[PDB]
Amino acid sequence: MADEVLIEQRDRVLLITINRPDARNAVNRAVSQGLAAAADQLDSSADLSVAIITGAGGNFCAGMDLKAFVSGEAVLSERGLGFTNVPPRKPIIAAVEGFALAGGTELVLSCDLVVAGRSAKFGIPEVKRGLVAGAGGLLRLPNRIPYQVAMELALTGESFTAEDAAKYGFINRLVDDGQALDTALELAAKITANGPLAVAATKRIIIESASWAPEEAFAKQGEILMPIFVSEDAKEGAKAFAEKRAPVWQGK
Amino acid sequence: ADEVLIEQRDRVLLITINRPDARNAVNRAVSQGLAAAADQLDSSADLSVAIITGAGGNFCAGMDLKAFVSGEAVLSERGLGFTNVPPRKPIIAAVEGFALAGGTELVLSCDLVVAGRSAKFGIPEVKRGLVAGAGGLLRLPNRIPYQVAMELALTGESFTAEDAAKYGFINRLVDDGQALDTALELAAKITANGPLAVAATKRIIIESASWAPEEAFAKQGEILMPIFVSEDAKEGAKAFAEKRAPVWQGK
Amino acid sequence: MADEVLIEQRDRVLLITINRPDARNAVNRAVSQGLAAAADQLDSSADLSVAIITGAGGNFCAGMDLKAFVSGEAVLSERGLGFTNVPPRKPIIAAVEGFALAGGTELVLSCDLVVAGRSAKFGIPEVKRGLVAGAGGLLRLPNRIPYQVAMELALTGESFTAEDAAKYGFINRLVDDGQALDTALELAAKITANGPLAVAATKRIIIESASWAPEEAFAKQGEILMPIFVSEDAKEGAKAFAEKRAPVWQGK
C-alpha cells in the first residue's frame, strides 16, 4: 500500500497529501506522525518556503480515526492531531475538497490560508455528543470569522460549507469542486516568488503580535525584522531589482 | 406585574424585561431582576440556555435616567443588569425595536443575536459628552469590523439590525415581531446539545482571547477535563451508538 | 518651495495635507517631522477634536522616500514614519486617493477611520524584495480585515484597491475618485459634533482594551471614564441636549 502521507517537493513548495481515501483521510498514527514530520521538514529545509496540505480522493480529512484509537493506536504526535497544536512556522495553505469535519476543520484552522471547492464541508460538532473540541478550533475559528458566527457554529455543532464561509474571508480562494489543489498551487507560487525568510518572518509577526504588550510590540517586531534586513536574500532583492532581473533566493 | 418576568421552558430560561411603557429602561428593579436571572440560569443544572427579550416590541432603552436622577442604585453587582459580569451559560438576545445605549451594551453582553429588521442599536454617549461604560467599547470592536465599531462609537449614530446583518452581528434577521419565536428555535438547536459542553465551549471562546499562546492549550485543557469525565459525555457516546437521543443531566 | 506638510484648522478639525506631489507624497524627513508636529498640534490644542490626513495632487502617500533614505536623511521621527509607531491620541481620518502603497498603507493603518476613492491602491509589498513591513502594517492589518485575508496580502505583497477592500470594513466611506476629502470632512463633522474629551476617551478605550486582562478591564476603563464624568463638557452636553440646541464644547 502507498504511504498514508505523501510528500512531494515542487521547487519551494512542499505538497503534503493525506493518503487514506477509503477512510476519508482520517488521522491514525501514521497520518499524525507523517503530518508532524512534514511540518518538521518544511521548517528545517532552506530550499522550502511554503507548504500545501490536501487530501487524496476529493476529501480533505474526516478528523480523528476513532477506530484506530479504539484499537490502541496513538493519534496524537508531538504537534497534536497531525500538527493542530503546533502548526509549522513557515506558511501553509489548506487545499480543501469535500469532507473536512471535526478534527479536519481543526487541522484546516491550524493553517494560514484556505483554498476550497465550494461544496467542501467544515464543522465543530463535539457539543452534540456532550464533548468540547480541544484541537484548537475554539481558539482559532472566532478569530477567522465574525465572533457570533463562530459562537453559533460551536454551540450548535452544525456543519457549514466553503460556499457559506466565503463571505467572511475564511476562504482565500473559492473555486469549483475539484479545483482546490491547482488553485492552491498558484497561490503558493505567488508567495514563493517572495523572499523565503521574509514570508516566514511576516507570518511570525502576524501570529505573535496578538500576544504582545503594545508598549513592547514595536521592539518585539524589530527583533524579528533585524535578521531579515541584513540577510543575503535582502541583498539579492535589491541587487536583482537594480539589475532588472528575477531574484535568486537562498533562505539566508 | 413584575418588572422582569422569568419563565422556564425545559432547558431554556426566558427572561423578559417588563416595563413596556418605559421602553424597558433599566431601573433598579430591572437591573436586580436581570442579575438574579443570570444567577438562576447559572445555578440551575436543568437549564442550558437563556433568552433575553423586551415586552411590547422594544428591547431596552438602556439606563432609566429618571431612576438614576432620583437616586435609585441602578447598577447591580453584575453591572447594568448583567453587562459587566454576563451569564456563564449561553444567552440569546431577541431584539425588537428600540435597543439603544445601555440596551446595545446589554445585547453585546449576550452571545448570539436574533433581531427584527427594524431593531435599532447604537452607542450614543459621546453626543452628550459621555463615554459608554457598560462594555460596549470593550466588545463591539470584537463583534463587527474594528473601524465600523470605531466609527459608530465616535459619531454615536444609530444603526439597524438590517445594516448590522452585513457584519455577522445578527445571527437571525427576521420580520419585525418574530424575534422571540425565532430565538426559541435557535435555542432549541443549542439545548439539543450537552449542557456542560455548550457552557464550556462558550467559556473557552471568551477566555481564549486573553491567554498567552504558549499556555493556551494547557488553559483549555483545564476546562476540558471536567467534561471528558462528565456523565453527559458518557451518555452522549452511549446514546449515539444506540442510535437514540441523549438524556442530559448537566453532570 | 511650499511647506511639505500643509496644516489648516476648520473649526475643530485639523486638516493635514502631505505636500510633495512631485514625489507622490513620499515621506522624507521634512514630511515625517511635519506629520509628527501636526499630531502634536492636534493633541495639545483644546479647540481641536479630530484630524484628517490626506495627500496633495490626487494621491495619498507613496511611502518612504527612497532617494531620501539612501542619501542619509534621518527620515524616522519620534513617532515613526510620520506617526506610524505613535499615532495621535485624538481621532484621525485618512482621506485616501490614488497611490497609497507600502509606507502609505501603514500610515493609513495608523489612523482610526478611512475614506477612499474607489481606485485608491494599497499594499504591503516588502516581501517581494526580501524585506518585512516594519511600520505597523503587520500589527494592524489583521485586526481591521479578516485574519486570513490580511495574512494573504502580507505574504503575497499584492496591491489591493479601496473597492476590493470595502467588503472587509477597511473603508468607512467608499466614494468616487476625487471625493475623498469632501466626504472625510463630512464624517469629521459628525464626530466634532460630539464631546471632544468623550470622543478621545472612546478611542483610547477601544485601542487599549485590546491589551487588558478581563478581570481588570472594567476598572481600567473606569480610570479613563472618571475625568469624563466630572468634565465641564459633560454638564454642557446634558444641558444642550435638554434644550435641543447645539452643545458648545470646550475640551474640559
> A240 to chain C, minimum CA–CA distance in Å?
9
What are residue A224's phi and psi, to 5 degrees? -70, -35
- State the nearest Cα–Cα gap between C141 and chain A, in angstroms: 9
Cβ pair C218, C188 in contact under 8 A: no
Residues forming a β-bridge with C247: none
CA distances to B11, C24, C138 from A238, in Å: 65, 22, 22
Question: In chain A, count of helices (H) and strands (E)?
Answer: 10, 11
Phi then psi dihedrals of residue B174, to 5 deg: -130, 165
Ramachandran angles phi, psi of B60, nearest 5°: -175, 125
Question: Residue A217's CB: how many other CB atoms inside 10 A?
Answer: 21
**Cβ–Cβ below 8 Å for C146 and A170:** yes
Q: Is beta strand C160-161 parallel, antiparallel or unpaired with respect to C113-117?
A: unpaired
Closest residue in B to A211 (Cα) is B212
Q: Are A32 and A73 in contact (CB under 8 A)?
A: no
How many helices, marked H, and strands, marked E, lie in chain C? Answer: 10, 8
User: What φ, ψ does residue B40 adopt, rounded to 5°?
Assistant: -65, -50
Angle subtended at Cα B9 by Cα B5 and Cα B11, rounded to the nearest 5 degrees: 115
Task: Let me know if the fold of C1-194 is the same as that of C195-252.
Answer: no
Class for the domain spanning B1-193: alpha beta
CA gap C13, B248 in Å, rounded:
60
Method: X-ray
d(CA C218, CA C233): 23
B144–C202 C-beta distance less than 8 A = no
The residues spanned by each domain of chain B are 1-193, 194-251
Q: Which chain C residues are within 8 Å of A213, Cβ to Cβ?
A: 211
What single-letter amino acid sits at C219? A
Is the distance from CB of A86 to CB of A206 less than 8 angstroms?
Answer: no
First and final CA of chain A: distance in angstroms? 39
C-alpha cell recorded at residue B54: 423586551
* Chain A positions in Cβ-Cβ contact with residue C154 (cut-off 8 Å): 202-203, 206
Mutate to test the interface with A, among C85, C109, C155 (most CBs of A within 10 A): C155
Query: Measured between CB atoms, which of A112, A213, A234 is closest to C211?
Result: A213
Binary contact (C139, A247; C-beta < 8 A): no
Rg, C-alpha atoms of chain B? 19
CB A99 within 8 A of CB A56: no
Distance CA B10, CA B16 (A): 17
- A230 burial level (CB within 10 Å; 0-12, 13-18, 19+): exposed
CA nearest to A201, candidates A179, A158, A230, A236: A230
Q: Do B190 and A155 touch (CB under 8 A)?
A: yes
* A237 closest CB neighbour out of C130, C147, C154: C130
Instruction: Provide the b/e sequence for C124-133 (b: ≥16 CB within 10 Å).
Output: bbbbbbbbbb
Angle between helices C232-243 and C196-209 (to 10 degrees): 120
Q: Which is nearest to A80 in space by CA: A152, A148, A9, A139?
A: A139
Nearest C-alpha neighbor of A194 from the set A148, A134, A139, A236: A236
Query: Per DSSP, what are the bridge partners of residue B53?
Result: B16, B94
Choose the closest CB to C113 out of B150, B167, B210.
Answer: B150
Answer yes or no: are the C-beta atoms of A243 and A225 closer than 8 Å.
Answer: no
Cα atoms in the Cβ-side hemisphere of radius 13 Å centred on A133? 35
Using a CB-CB cut-off of 8 Å, the residues of chain C touching B100 are none
Intra-chain end-to-end CA distance of chain C, in Å:
39
Report residue C73: phi and psi, to 5°: -60, 135
Alpha-carbon torsion, ordered A82, B213, C86, C125, to 10 deg? 0
Residue type (1 letter), B63: M
A127, A149, A212, A216: best to mutate for the B interface, most B CBs within 10 A: A127
Going edge to edge, which strands form the sheet with B91-95? B4-9, B12-17, B49-54, B91-95, B112-116, B172-174
Q: Resolution of the coordinates in A?
A: 2.1
Q: Are strands A113-117 and A99-101 parallel, antiparallel or unpaired?
A: unpaired
What's the CATH number of domain C195-252, 3.10.290.10, 1.10.12.10, 3.90.180.10, 1.25.40.420? 1.10.12.10
CA A96 – CA B33 distance, rounded (Å): 49
> So which residues of B are the catalytic ones?
105, 125
Over the Cα atoms of chain A, what is R_g?
Answer: 19
Nearest by CB to residue B194, choosing from A130, A133, A208, is A130
Interior angle at CA C110, CA C107 and CA C116, nearest 5: 65
* Burial bucket for residue A185 (CB in 10 Å: 0-12, 13-18, 19+): middle
CA distance A38 to A30: 12
Q: Annotated active-site positions of C, please?
A: 106, 126
Minimum distance, in Å, between the CA of residue C227 and any CA atom of chain A:
23
Q: What is the DSSP string of C170-203?
A: --SEEE-TT-HHHHHHHHHHHHHTS-HHHHHHHH
> What is the C-alpha separation between C31 and A189, in angstroms, rounded?
37
Q: Tell me the longest C-alpha to C-alpha distance in chain A.
A: 63
In terms of Cα–Cα distance, which of C137, B208, C128 is closest to A238? C128
DSSP secondary structure, B117-144, as one string: TT-EE---GGGGT----SSHHHHHHHHS
CATH of C1-194, one of 3.40.50.1970, 3.90.226.10, 2.40.440.10, 3.40.50.300: 3.90.226.10
- Do B105 and B152 touch, CB atoms closer than 8 A? no
Q: How many CB atoms lie under 10 A from the CB of residue B90?
A: 26
Number of helices (H), then strands (E), belonging to chain B: the values are 10, 8
- Alpha carbons C242 and C228: distance in angstroms, whole number: 19
Give phi and psi for B72, each to the nearest 5: -65, 135
Q: Would you call A26 helix, strand, or coil by DSSP?
A: coil
Extended strands (E) in A89-153: 92-96, 99-101, 113-117, 121-123
- Distance between CA C153 and CA A83 in Å, rounded? 24
Under an 8 A CB cutoff, do C241 and B127 touch? yes
- Which cell is A210 given? 496578538
Distance of CA B204 to the CA centre of its chain: 16
Contact C141, C109 (CB under 8 A): yes
Cβ–Cβ gap A128/B212 under 8 Å: no
Contact B201, A127 (CB under 8 A): yes
In angstroms, the CA C230 to CA C212 distance is 24
C41: burial class by Cβ within 10 Å (0-12, 13-18, 19+)? Answer: middle
d(CA B80, CA B77): 9
Superfamily for B194-251? Lyase 2-enoyl-coa Hydratase, Chain  A, domain 2 (1.10.12.10)
CA dist A222 → A60, A217, A225, C73, C85 (Å): 38, 9, 5, 20, 12
The rounded distance, in Å, linking the Cα atoms of A15 and A148 is 34
Q: Tell me the CA distances in angstroms from C144 to B190, C111, C171, one per residue in order.
A: 31, 11, 10
What residue spans of chain C are helical by DSSP H? 29-44, 66-71, 103-109, 137-144, 147-156, 162-165, 180-192, 196-209, 217-229, 232-243
For chain B, what's the residue count? 251
The separation between CA A115 and the C-alpha centre of its own chain, rounded to angstroms, equals 10
Whether residue B138 and residue C203 make contact (CB cut-off 8 A), yes or no, is: no
For residues C74 and C50, give the distance between their C-alpha atoms in angstroms, rounded to a whole number.
28
Question: Are A96 and A162 a contacting pair, CB within 8 Å?
Answer: yes
Query: Using H for helix, E for strand and C for coil, what is the string for A176-200?
Result: CCCCHHHHHHHHHHHHHCCCHHHHH
